[PDB]
Every structure is written in structure tokens, then in C-alpha cells.
Curated annotation (Swiss-Prot):
Chief place of localization: secreted
Residue span(s) of domain C-type lysozyme: 1-130
Gene for this chain: LYZ
The keyword Secreted belongs to this UniProt entry's keyword annotation: yes
Coiled coil residues, start to end: none
The enzyme's E.C. designation: 3.2.1.17
Keywords, comma-separated and alphabetical: Amyloid, Amyloidosis, Antimicrobial, Bacteriolytic enzyme, Disease variant, Disulfide bond, Glycosidase, Hydrolase, Secreted, Signal
Protein name (database record): Lysozyme C
Clinical condition linked: Amyloidosis, hereditary systemic 5: A form of hereditary systemic amyloidosis, a disorder characterized by amyloid deposition in multiple tissues resulting in a wide clinical spectrum. AMYLD5 primarily affects the viscera, and the predominant clinical features are renal dysfunction of varying severity, and intra-abdominal bleeding. Inheritance is autosomal dominant.
Gene Ontology terms, MF aspect: identical protein binding; lysozyme activity
Pfam family, any one: Lys
């Protein structure tokens, strides 16, 4: 499913993402925008280390979910990577919360550092009523 901007913003707020571990809603929106374009079925294979990025937040199979073909991988969210490809984003959100709980926080996603850090991210939630 490809979410529309505000539709996603409202969904994330309802799922308790606003201010989760100090991360504002607009930051999660910026992250979702640059990682997948708000697309829940997006997948990305990393030829270099044999891991795959799954779903709306492009969560990595090496540490977060299990896809069975990634070498020396762990499953911190204790989920099949398949769960991160559903239209319903509840599981993807619960796993994103787990990633943020780590020492790096939102910084765990390099894309966030490149496209969101120290930027005016208000635009991602403006006009959405959240």
C-alpha cells in the first residue's frame, strides 16, 4: 500500500509514534518519506552484505526481522520480515519502536541523518491535523 501523506501522519499518531523516545511525528514522516516513499511493500536487497530492507521504514533483516537467508542475522523485533510488508502497519511500527529504543535512536537509519537531521521537517505534517 502507498499511503498518502496526511493519511499516514494520522495513522502514526494513533499508533503512538509522536514523541516516541523523544522522536517527533514529523521525523518519522521524514524517515518514511525517504526510506520508501510511504510504500509498505518496498524491499531493497543489499548485494554487499546479503541483507534486505523491508517495508515502510526499510527495516534491515540483519538485526531486526527474520527472513532466513541473511547470514549471521538476529531477529530483535521477533518477527518474520514478511510482517513488515503488510498494508496494516501495526507490526512495522512496533518494530520501528524497538529500533528507536536502541542507543542510536532515530540515528540508526542513515537516511535520517542524510535527509532529515537538522532540517526543517515541519512540512511533512503540516495541514494533516495532527
Amino acid at each position: 500500500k502507498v499511503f498518502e501523506r496526511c493519511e499516514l501522519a494520522r495513522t502514526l499518531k494513533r499508533l503512538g509514534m509522536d514523541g516516541y523516545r523523544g522522536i517527533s511525528l514529523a521525523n518519522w514522516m521524514c524517515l518514511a518519506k525517504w526510506e520508501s516513499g510511504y510504500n509498505t511493500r518496498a524491499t531493497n536487497y543489499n548485494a554487499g552484505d546479503r541483507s534486505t530492507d523491508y517495508g515502510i521504514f526499510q527495516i534491515n533483516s540483519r538485526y531486526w526481522c527474520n527472513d532466513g537467508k541473511t547470514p549471521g542475522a538476529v531477529n530483535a523485533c521477533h518477527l518474520s520480515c514478511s510482517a513488515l510488508l503488510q498494508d496494516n502497519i501495526a507490526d512495522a511500527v512496533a518494530c520501528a519502536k524497538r529500533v528507536a529504543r536502541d542507543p542510536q535512536g532515530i540515528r540508526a537509519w542513515v537516511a535520517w541523518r542524510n535527509r532529515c537531521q537538522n532540517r526543517d521537517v515541519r512540512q511533512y505534517v503540516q495541514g494533516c491535523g495532527v
